Amino acid sequence: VDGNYSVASNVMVPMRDGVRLAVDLYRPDADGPVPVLLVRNPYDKFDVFAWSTQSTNWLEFVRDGYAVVIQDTRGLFASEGEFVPHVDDEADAEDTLSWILEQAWCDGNVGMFGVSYLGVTQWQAAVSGVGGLKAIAPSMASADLYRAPWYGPGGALSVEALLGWSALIGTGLITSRSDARPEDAADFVQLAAILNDVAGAASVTPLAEQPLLGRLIPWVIDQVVDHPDNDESWQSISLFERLGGLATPALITAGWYDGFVGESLRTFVAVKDNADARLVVGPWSHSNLTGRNADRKFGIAATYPIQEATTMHKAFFDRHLRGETDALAGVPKVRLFVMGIDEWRDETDWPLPDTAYTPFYLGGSGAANTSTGGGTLSTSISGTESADTYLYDPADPVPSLGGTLLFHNGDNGPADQRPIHDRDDVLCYSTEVLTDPVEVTGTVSARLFVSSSAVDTDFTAKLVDVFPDGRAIALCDGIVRMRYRETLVNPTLIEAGEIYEVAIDMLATSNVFLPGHRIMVQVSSSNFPKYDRNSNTGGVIAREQLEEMCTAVNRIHRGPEHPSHIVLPIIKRK
Amino acid sequence: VDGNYSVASNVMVPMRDGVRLAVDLYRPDADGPVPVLLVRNPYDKFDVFAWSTQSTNWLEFVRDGYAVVIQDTRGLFASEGEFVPHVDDEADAEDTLSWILEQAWCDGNVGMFGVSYLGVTQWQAAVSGVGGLKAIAPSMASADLYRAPWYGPGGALSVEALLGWSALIGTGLITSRSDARPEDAADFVQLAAILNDVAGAASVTPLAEQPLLGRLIPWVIDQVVDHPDNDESWQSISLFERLGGLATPALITAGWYDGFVGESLRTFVAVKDNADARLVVGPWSHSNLTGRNADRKFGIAATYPIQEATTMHKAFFDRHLRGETDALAGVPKVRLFVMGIDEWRDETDWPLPDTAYTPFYLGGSGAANTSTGGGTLSTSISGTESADTYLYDPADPVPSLGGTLLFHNGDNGPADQRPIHDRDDVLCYSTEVLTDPVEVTGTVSARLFVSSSAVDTDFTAKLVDVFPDGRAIALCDGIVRMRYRETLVNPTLIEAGEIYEVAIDMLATSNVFLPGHRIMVQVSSSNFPKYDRNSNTGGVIAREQLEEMCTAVNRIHRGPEHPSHIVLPIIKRK
Numbered sequence A, B: 001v002d003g004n005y006s007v008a009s010n011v012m013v014p015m016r017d018g019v020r021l022a023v024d025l026y027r028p029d030a031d032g033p034v035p036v037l038l039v040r041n042p043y044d045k046f047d048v049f050a051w052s053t054q055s056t057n058w059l060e061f062v063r064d065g066y067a068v069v070i071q072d073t074r075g076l077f078a079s080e081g082e083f084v085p086h087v088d089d090e091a092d093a094e095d096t097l098s099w100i101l102e103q104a105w106c107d108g109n110v111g112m113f114g115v116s117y118l119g120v121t122q123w124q125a126a127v128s129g130v131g132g133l134k135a136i137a138p139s140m141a142s143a144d145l146y147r148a149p150w151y152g153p154g155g156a157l158s159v160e161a162l163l164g165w166s167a168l169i170g171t172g173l174i175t176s177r178s179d180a181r182p183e184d185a186a187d188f189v190q191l192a193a194i195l196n197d198v199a200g201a202a203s204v205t206p207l208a209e210q211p212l213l214g215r216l217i218p219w220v221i222d223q224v225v226d227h228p229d230n231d232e233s234w235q236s237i238s239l240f241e242r243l244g245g246l247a248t249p250a251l252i253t254a255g256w257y258d259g260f261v262g263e264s265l266r267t268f269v270a271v272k273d274n275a276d277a278r279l280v281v282g283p284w285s286h287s288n289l290t291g292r293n294a295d296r297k298f299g300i301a302a303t304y305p306i307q308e309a310t311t312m313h314k315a316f317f318d319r320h321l322r323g324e325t326d327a328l329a330g331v332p333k334v335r336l337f338v339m340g341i342d343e344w345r346d347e348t349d350w351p352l353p354d355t356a357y358t359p360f361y362l363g364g365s366g367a368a369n370t371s372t373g374g375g376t377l378s379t380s381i382s383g384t385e386s387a388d389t390y391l392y393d394p395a396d397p398v399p400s401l402g403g404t405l406l407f408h409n410g411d412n413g414p415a416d417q418r419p420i421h422d423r424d425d426v427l428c429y430s431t432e433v434l435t436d437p438v439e440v441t442g443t444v445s446a447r448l449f450v451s452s453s454a455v456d457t458d459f460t461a462k463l464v465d466v467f468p469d470g471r472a473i474a475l476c477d478g479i480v481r482m483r484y485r486e487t488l489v490n491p492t493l494i495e496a497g498e499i500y501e502v503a504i505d506m507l508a509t510s511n512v513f514l515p516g517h518r519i520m521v522q523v524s525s526s527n528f529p530k531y532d533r534n535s536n537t538g539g540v541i542a543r544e545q546l547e548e549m550c551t552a553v554n555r556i557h558r559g560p561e562h563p564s565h566i567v568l569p570i571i572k573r574k
Ligand SMILES: [Cl-]
Pocket: none
């Protein structure tokens, strides 16, 4: 009977090493084999409500004649084995895909879908070379784990992401275990204490000493904290260089305030030439898909459009798993939520064709320190040679507010920045009030001429939309850790007092700055706990006591011979 | 096989009038009949993800050997017939329960669960007298539709609730229809415009002229707007008086910032003596169960505890549907999230035994207008005869901020009240800074001595926790519409200038005001759009143009002969 199905729980699937993973099978009432969709999940396959509201109404797929397989990852919940993040997922996915393809009920066409960790596992599956995998749909995902979510393109540790995720998975690992232990109860309390106060947890020095988290999940230290360079340990689990040779259709979803955004978008660019790639980007953070934030509301249309997403996924899988050649007729290649106008808009490509990468130069009379300083932004090079100077003290970093926070206050992406504007280490540069709209849609970066009293330090840049009422709404930001200015792989220190031209990767945005608004850039040397704090020593940052760290007098140079600027992806639509 | 199940979609169930309602059957793999749980849903039975995250991981029930039936209400989605809210649900539930009881797979024991509208339908089902209904679990529900969600104990229309819900259901009614209409597209846009701006929609006068909503759902005007008195049209759909004679176990869930809270709690009190009743109350609003708000965070333990709720529901149904006499061993009768200390706590009853209903009298030197006025609260009667006076202008009502808002900004219950504190029509009375904690847990009310220049007007009272940093966090509030001061059924007007002693029902809270905090009360004559604005004319409010309305000079009397006070349910736990 069409629309009817059955569910088989805890079907045990043998991996190559004999370890069995648990799956649930959602199989339609049908008279032959059917196309199959796989979801690989470290948060209990049973608990479908927890993640699905962030993805698709995927029971519609089953009602429409797809089978759906949901799997517990190795060493979690009903699965056998031992859990270590990322390292087993390529092989386990290959073996899982092979098993599905052998079953009576599978017609030889398999796809995947799902969000975050359920998205990363899809790239790991796609590089396996299993011919029966016809399409993937990675949402809020990354193909380079160093670049997201653990470190970043600037070479700073995403400390809140690491500690929050570890505490979340830690809670799962305890719940999953062979038999309850006497220390379980106290461990839960401590994990809850971390999740209630991630910035506090991230503030303890040395950072690398994590009694609880290091015991529950040794990987947190052995892999992540201990490998600050993008070295061979990271390349091993990286998929990105392999993406260019793939020919697998991918339905890619991202959020402007999502921790994975830079890497999600990069995956689209990497696969678009060789296969049918699609892109959907909304104004969401990892834990807030509602479109509603404390000081910024995007409208009901901004709410994660789960039924539209479900329709689009089904059309996509119909095209690639069911060979229906017209299934994606009328479906755009790219669909973006353009903030400011606060509207969804169809595009033919990402980056947008007809992006004008435009420098906006830092300038102004007198110090740009604080929002009441003299800092300006202009499409013209600054006429006079100036410098803004501040003290960066690791004991007092600039607090993270909005942006791409995951676990520490990760539900307020477009955060009002006014609470940090009277700080002396926050340099502010803004345009005049705009008489006419300026659209900024694409990847964003800064080029700054900088110097320091230290042999290492950080520089941050943050793009901000200043509203008529004074709200200064965060759009996108990045960091450069100076030892990694040239390379993430082979860092070198800087000479105190010497001027360097450095790039800051500020990820991406889509915003129309409307008449009455200003374009604003904040520059500093910290953004904590989004990124860990640079010790200003040149040492092994995660191994240093706070008292071992140094302050740094940092300087931004601006003028004709040091034309520091932000590069904005300008779109003009008449 | 234990843990396995099947799903049959769109099974058509005949009602007494021959109209067929659509259900989905989730039936376990079993060798005999099983106990059955029913959910009655106006938001598409297919769309399980939309409501379930607010309820239970109910697939665990199916894996544990319960069948689950989810039904589309009459006239919506896959069901036949015509949709009108509330009026058909008693009969349709009786016929649905009868059909389930007749099926091969039902063992004669049926229960219900679910949230909001899926909770109200459970009281309607329980009064039907179907013996096979052994237990219900109404979450965020009401047994008196006048008192919640449409009007209230004070006799004011909950206008934002009415317009928001109508627009939501309107969107469903269009999606559900026989065949797409040319005007559907424009109707969707207009419904979206209402949902993006509920206060704007509520501001149009006369209120009763609703071209779009009145066309899509005539009931919005014919029943709700046209019947401001708690008259025979309301008693018809009211279940409350019938609750006292029931003997049906009920697992009742509520939220301190939920629109249905006063009525949810009343249902517990009404049934507790004759059957096994349970109560669970968290710090949630109808659309925000996260425990996180713009200016107030309750901790991760405050997040709606879906797996604990699932375990408790299953134990409850095991006890009452499966006759397992020890199933609820160790389960508390009452479990409350006590705000301030921000901890869950078990209790033996609601109201708490050992509640001291304590008057806190309004006082102070000079005007209590604004937060910088002289208004005080004290357990001692005020020594001097004073009065605070303000102008209430319907064209400029006090805006709603937090509280029990449903659709207009309904995701910020514990809202900071500072944005309205410099208003002259907001009278503020506060205690000294507390040296020691004061717990307020129970139902809350005010008794005010009031006078007006008008023949009708409103008075509002709002309890507030003032934090050390200045945040003035809303706790609970109510309203009295003066024509309904004595009765909701047979209103009479007041004489201008005459003093009346009036009661204001402020629903309920659980809060410890900690050392360093103040207890604060705000008094006014509007709270819009939580409640519609009184026109100050004595007229038919919903039929008046703004220009037809009058201003009112309103007065709060306080002193020895007019001891205006708030009654706080004080708990002392040494
Ligand atoms: Cl089988």
